[PDB]
Design a protein around this ligand. Structure first.
Ligand SMILES: Nc1ncnc2c1ncn2[C@@H]1O[C@H](COP(=O)(O)OP(=O)(O)O)[C@@H](O)[C@H]1O
Ligand SMILES: Nc1ncnc2c1ncn2[C@@H]1O[C@H](COP(=O)(O)OP(=O)(O)O)[C@@H](O)[C@H]1O
Lengths: 711, 201, 326
């Protein structure tokens, strides 16, 4: 009772899970004990009892807490009984360990892109086995832990690789209801006599996977409804038909939940009334050695593509795991609401190294380390707040490279592009700025009539967003001061890459119209292979259900709710016009991941809950646009006033830097600073100086004509 | 010197009252003296951008004798490159622009999209009270067009008459995207207002 | 004599004040004219490139492109400017203003002969003799970029990647074509004398079977022209491709074809010459300009009136041009 727990329940209410798991284990093993002695039988029974007690009383604790519990449960039953450890397992009977049960697989390069690829390791298979037992024990499941632990990944691993079970994926929104669940089960269950609801299959049970159950919001009287609905299904073993008013009994269904800890902002604490009937497990962060093995396997699978340095997999695995460890160490979420670190971004780092290697020329050692460092700058040190932590990251990269086995490492000097040629390689600054200038001038002459500047900070950001866009599942968050040019940057990179711009023209709008626009975009993407990029501003979002839909498609690789019925019928008809159920849906997932890219242009750091959502952190490459710098704006002002010759008594530098100084004083006398005031001032000054200097020029010309006539 | 003062006065001091605007002016003039640029010691922007005949033209429609209101509608009329914004809980800017234009002033509030489409088709000036209820107009307030001139309002292309002006007014003492594009003008009386008023009286 | 390939090193370099946008040599005299984006026309003798023979400024805005034509006799020099003015001068060794033209409401892009293309959405056709307005037409719902005239037929590719073939007396679109994902930068007919080998007698009477197209997506595509009836054929008015040509590292600006070896220029500091038979790049010239290679020009091998001499010339954005002899 006195140890640490999450979702604190009474100790009276875990005995259900403990006893039911133990009895199911004994009923599964019973028909093998007929040829066993009394002592071996008693040892097996006490081993299973100890395992049930440990995994039903300390399931919501951490690894060191679990080891303290295992030593206390060893010393509280005496040493005569069979001992239980972290790796202990009963299997054909004989005492064994989990360490000899893991499989071995060596995947090649072209399937690392799949988000559902599951790597085998020790904790994964241990939680797999306990998940199997606890699901077969006719008991509800909830998994809670820090973000990035792989709850959805472990769920898909356990549910896809079972012949007795299937998967139905539903994701809750901020505003939920009861027909979400009925709609999710509508495509996979049928009503039979509807007195009884059963899965469409007959031999395999169907389990409802719901994730982020903390997300739904309470009403004004301190009570939600969806968790009570879940409690009614997984306790009463039935529910009430809302329009028909009859009891509907469900027997082979199961309820499994995934959620964040209640300490996360925007995540409510549930009543113990619902968690009473379920079984809770803590899914913590994997240990250092487990991550080391996982990324060793990943780096071996990625250096299969470059066979010259196959023996250098192990130092890079140590460097990546260690670097993640002190990257989580030196700052946390207590300083800012976006410093959330997880294995997700290390996986995406491996993905970026993959696409850079595959889409690149012949590589050597120093090129490979500098590419790795550039990707580390790309994905780890991209949403920070100052340059001190940036140079700390640089020296951190230096020390981990020299301790795990040079050239420049800094991202400002390492310039990797894909527009200068057909391969992803090192490029030339002059060539890139010339190409960007030519592209912008032809864009201005063609479509958008803004006589607008090009400078080094914005071309660097263009490179940033182009690198983020060229990848698959490439969705990036642009947060910066207003009128900095994020929307124009997105339009420019879409024009250069080839993606066409679509925008939602929103109150005076609804879910029906927005999903009609979405379905039109989806149909165009599926039929014409249309490259779609959609631009959302602050005014384009009013309901949190929109963000829930993008969060669903982003945390997952797809939308498992809005693609159903006659829409599926016409979609498959058109696809078979162009061309199994699971394979067809997987190819749909792949093509919609390769042919869709969402951008958010949000300036306010609903938006606070948007950034704070760690599910939204999954496939968002949060790029810190930030505010302008004094040197950067001196450059842009010098470029802007160059078209207006005004040197009279140079003075252009003096006027631009004194204007800079005045607005610095104004900001200090009155958080981000919006550069709209600056650009409005520069434009007004330029137009007024030009117009009134022309007027004074013709006035002085008339005066000179009069003076020449009178002299 | 007077031109840089005029530009920075019309773009930076729209939402500042007399005391802090005087502090900003004296700090800016000290900065100009630091940077050693020629200017005018005895210069006022009202003496620059307000013509006496047009001053009387605004005077015959509800102009107040306070110089704060003078610089207020001077900044309003000088906002040509950007759309103007009128912050007034007392509802006086709407009245003065309505009786200064006349039938040109078309009064709308937040079928508003159809009314706005008709207004931009006929070239009609539109003023909305309670601008916090604001998106259709977003392209027009960004002032970016598809040259033929055409207007891609909503989902159906339209044509701009060429004589269109757009004013937005509110009363609550605002989206940041809206705020950046607009020219915010303050009309709240404070201690500096009563200071100057009793001093001149 | 028709299978000449220029050497790698440039013969000499014409230094220009601003970026070169159009180059054209005199078919008769050994002189060349370069028109820039600053409204500047520089005339340079082909064997005397030291001093500018004629540095003229008659254009307020940029000159995108220009060409010349010999009367059937003097030479016509047609120049254009983005302020919607078209000029025709007289070469004595100076430019003498012969005539001016108007009728375009926006920036003019290119000229052909006199006809011209612009960005003002309207196709307008005048006469050099008359100088008045004769023909107006709308090519597509979206405006075209590259046009040309071959007797009485015009092919046009628009910003929406739409090719249309029209006939001046009939006034109807003979065929429609498409296939790229990007707007077409240049489209050109292919005539006969595998591209110059006719297939049937009907197409021998026609003379056009293939056509080349270049865009900014680093692709060169040759398109088959469907059989027309004049009156259009609804069932025989669709283009089709047979070979995709690539190799450029940037946008393809302009293309030129002669014999079997075709020349192209791209923004990757390079000019590449290919063969239409094997598809392998016969030569890649690198480092021609510090800026992008904007335009190419050679003696017109497709016209027997002009002598296809031993000359080549290219322009660039680096305020310089390279002319190749020997
Ligand atoms: N130990 C691990 N082994 C392999 N992949 C992992 C591991 N941990 C995390 N991942 C990656 O993280 C993703 C799972 O994210 P998850 O933690 O389910 O998101 P959320 O925190 O929103 O539930 C998977 O796509 C997987 O590739
Ligand atoms: N480099 C730039 N410097 C200053 N202003 C710019 C720049 N690029 C674009 N803008 C202006 O910003 C507007 C678009 O701003 P946007 O990118 O939407 O800002 P945000 O993304 O912060 O809302 C355009 O109308 C343009 O006039």
């Amino acid at each position: 009772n006195d140890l640490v727990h999450i979702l604190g329940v009474r100790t009276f209410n875990k005995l259900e899970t403990a006893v039911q798991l133990a009895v199911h284990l004994i009923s599964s093993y019973r028909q093998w004990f007929q040829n066993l002695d009394d002592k071996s039988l008693k040892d097996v029974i006490t081993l299973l009892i100890k395992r049930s007690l440990l995994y039903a009383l300390a399931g919501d604790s951490t690894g060191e807490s679990q080891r303290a519990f295992i030593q206390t449960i060893n010393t509280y039953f005496g040493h005569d009984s069979q001992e239980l450890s972290d790796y202990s397992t009963i299997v054909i009977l004989s005492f064994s360990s989990f360490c000899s049960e893991i499989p071995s697989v060596s995947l090649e390069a072209h399937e690392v892109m799949r988000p559902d690829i599951v790597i085998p390791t020790i904790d994964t298979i241990k939680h797999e086995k306990i998940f199997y037992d606890l699901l077969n024990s006719k008991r509800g499941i909830i998994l809670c832990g820090p973000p990035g632990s792989g709850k959805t990944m472990i769920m898909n691993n356990a549910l896809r690789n079972s012949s007795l079970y299937d998967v139905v994926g539903i994701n809750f929104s901020k505003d939920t209801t009861t027909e979400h669940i009925l709609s999710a089960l509508h495509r996979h269950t049928n009503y039979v006599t509807g007195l009884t609801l059963l899965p469409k299959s007959d031999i395999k049970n169907l389990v409802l996977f719901c994730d982020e159950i903390n997300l739904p919001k309470l009403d004004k009287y301190g009570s939600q409804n969806v968790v009570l609905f879940l409690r009614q299904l997984m306790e009463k073993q039935g529910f009430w038909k809302t329009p028909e008013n009859k009891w509907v009994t469900i027997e082979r269904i199961h309820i499994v939940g995934a959620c964040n800890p209640p300490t996360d902002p925007g995540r409510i604490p549930m009543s113990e009334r619902f968690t009473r009937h379920a079984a809770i497990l803590y899914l913590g962060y994997p240990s250092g050695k487990s991550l080391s093995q996982i990324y060793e396997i990943y780096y071996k699978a990625i250096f299969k593509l470059v066979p010259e340095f196959r023996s250098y997999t192990e130092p890079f695995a140590r460097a990546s795991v260690h670097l993640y460890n002190e990257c989580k160490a030196r700052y946390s979420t207590g300083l800012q609401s976006h410093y959330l670190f997880s294995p997700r971004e290390l996986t995406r780092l491996v993905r970026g190294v993959y696409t850079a290697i595959n889409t690149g020329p012949r590589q050597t050692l120093r090129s490979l380390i500098r590419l790795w460092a550039y990707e580390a700058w790309r994905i780890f040190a991209d949403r920070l707040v100052g340059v001190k932590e940036k140079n700390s990251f640089e020296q951190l990269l230096y020390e981990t490279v020299d301790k795990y086995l040079l050239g420049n490492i800094s991202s400002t000097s390492l310039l990797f592009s894909g527009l200068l040629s057909l391969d992803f390689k090192e490029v030339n600054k002059t060539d890139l700025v010339n190409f960007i200038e030519e592209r912008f001038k032809t864009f201005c002459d063609e479509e958008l009539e803004v006589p607008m500047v090009i400078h080094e900070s914005m071309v660097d950001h263009i490179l940033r967003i182009d690198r983020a866009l060229k990848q698959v599942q490439g969705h990036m968050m642009l947060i910066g001061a207003s009128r900095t040019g994020k929307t124009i940057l997105t339009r420019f990179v879409a024009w250069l890459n080839g993606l066409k711009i679509v925008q939602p023209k929103i109150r005076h709008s609804n879910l029906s119209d927005f999903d009609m626009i979405l379905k039109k975009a989806i149909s165009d993407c599926s039929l014409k292979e249309s490259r779609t990029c959609l631009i959302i501003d602050e005014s384009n979002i009013l309901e949190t259900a929109f963000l829930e839909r993008m969060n669903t498609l982003l945390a997952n690789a797809d939308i498992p709710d809005l693609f159903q019925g006659e829409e599926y019928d016409k979609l498959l008809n058109n696809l078979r016009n162009k061309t199994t159920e699971q394979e067809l849906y997987d190819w749909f997932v792949g093509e919609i991941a390769k042919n869709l890219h969402v951008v958010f242009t949000i300036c306010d750091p609903k938006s606070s809950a948007m950034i704070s959502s760690p599910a939204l952190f999954n496939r968002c490459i949060i790029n810190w646009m930030g505010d302008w710098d004094t040197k950067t704006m001196s450059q842009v002002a010098n470029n802007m006033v160059d078209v207006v010759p005004m040197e009279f008594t140079t003075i252009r530098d003096a006027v631009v830097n004194i204007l800079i100084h005045f607005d610095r004083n104004f900001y200090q006398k009155m958080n981000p600073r919006s550069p709209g005031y600056f650009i409005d001032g520069l434009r007004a000054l330029v137009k007024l100086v030009t117009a009134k200097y022309q007027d004074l020029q013709e006035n002085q010309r008339f005066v000179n004509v009069g003076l020449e006539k009178l002299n | 010197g007077n031109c840089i003062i005029s530009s920075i006065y019309e773009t930076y001091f729209g939402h500042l009252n007399e005391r802090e605007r005087g502090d900003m002016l004296v700090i800016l003039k000290r900065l100009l003296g630091k940077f050693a640029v020629k200017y005018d010691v005895n210069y006022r922007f009202i003496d620059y951008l307000v013509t006496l005949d047009e001053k009387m033209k605004w005077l015959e429609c509800g102009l107040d004798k306070n110089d704060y209101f003078l610089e207020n509608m001077s900044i309003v009329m000088n906002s040509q490159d950007a759309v103007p914004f009128l912050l007034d809980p007392s509802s006086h800017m709407i009245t003065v622009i309505s009786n200064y234009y006349g039938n040109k002033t078309v009064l709308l509030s937040f079928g508003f999209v159809k009314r706005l489409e008709n207004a931009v088709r006929f070239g009609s000036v539109v003023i909305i009270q309670d601008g916090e209820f604001f998106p259709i107009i977003s392209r027009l307030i960004s002032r970016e067009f598809n040259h033929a001139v055409t207007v891609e309002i909503g989902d159906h292309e339209v044509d701009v008459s060429g004589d269109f002006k757009l004013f937005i007014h509110s009363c609550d003492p605002i989206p940041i995207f809206l705020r950046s594009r607009v020219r915010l003008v303050h009309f709240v009386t404070n201690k500096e207002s009563i200071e100057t008023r009793i001093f001149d009286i | 004599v028709l299978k000449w390939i220029p050497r790698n090193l440039p013969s000499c370099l014409i230094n220009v004040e601003s970026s070169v946008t159009s180059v054209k040599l005199h078919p008769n005299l050994p002189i060349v004219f370069v028109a820039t984006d600053h409204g500047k026309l520089y005339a340079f003798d082909l064997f005397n490139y030291t001093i500018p023979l004629a540095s003229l400024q008659s254009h307020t805005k940029a000159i995108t492109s220009m060409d010349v034509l010999f009367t059937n006799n003097y030479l016509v020099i047609v120049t254009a400017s983005k302020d919607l003015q078209i000029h025709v001068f007289k070469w004595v060794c100076k430019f003498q203003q012969i005539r001016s033209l108007l009728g375009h409401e926006h920036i003019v892009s290119a000229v052909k002969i006199i006809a011209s293309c612009s960005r003002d959405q309207t196709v307008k056709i005048w006469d050099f003799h008359n100088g008045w307005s004769l023909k107006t037409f709308q090519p597509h719902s979206q405006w075209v970029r590259s046009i040309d005239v071959l007797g009485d037929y015009i092919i046009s590719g628009s910003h929406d990647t739409t090719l249309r073939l029209t006939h001046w007396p009939s006034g109807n679109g003979l065929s429609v074509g498409t296939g790229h994902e990007f707007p077409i930068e240049k489209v050109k007919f292919i005539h006969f004398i595998r591209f110059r080998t006719p297939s049937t007698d009907r197409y021998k009477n026609w003379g056009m079977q293939y056509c080349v197209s270049a865009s900014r997506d680093r692709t060169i595509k040759i398109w088959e022209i469907p059989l027309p009836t004049p009156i259009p054929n609804p069932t025989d008015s669709n283009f089709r491709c047979v070979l995709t040509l690539k190799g450029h590292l940037s946008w393809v600006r302009d293309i030129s074809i002669r014999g079997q070896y075709l020349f192209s220029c791209a923004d990757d500091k390079s000019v590449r010459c290919w063969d239409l038979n094997t598809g392998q790049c016969l030569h890649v010239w690198e480092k021609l300009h510090t800026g992008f290679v904007n335009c190419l020009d050679l003696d017109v091998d497709f016209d027997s009136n002009v002598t296809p001499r031993q000359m080549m010339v290219t322009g660039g954005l680096d305020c310089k041009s390279n002319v190749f002899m020997r």
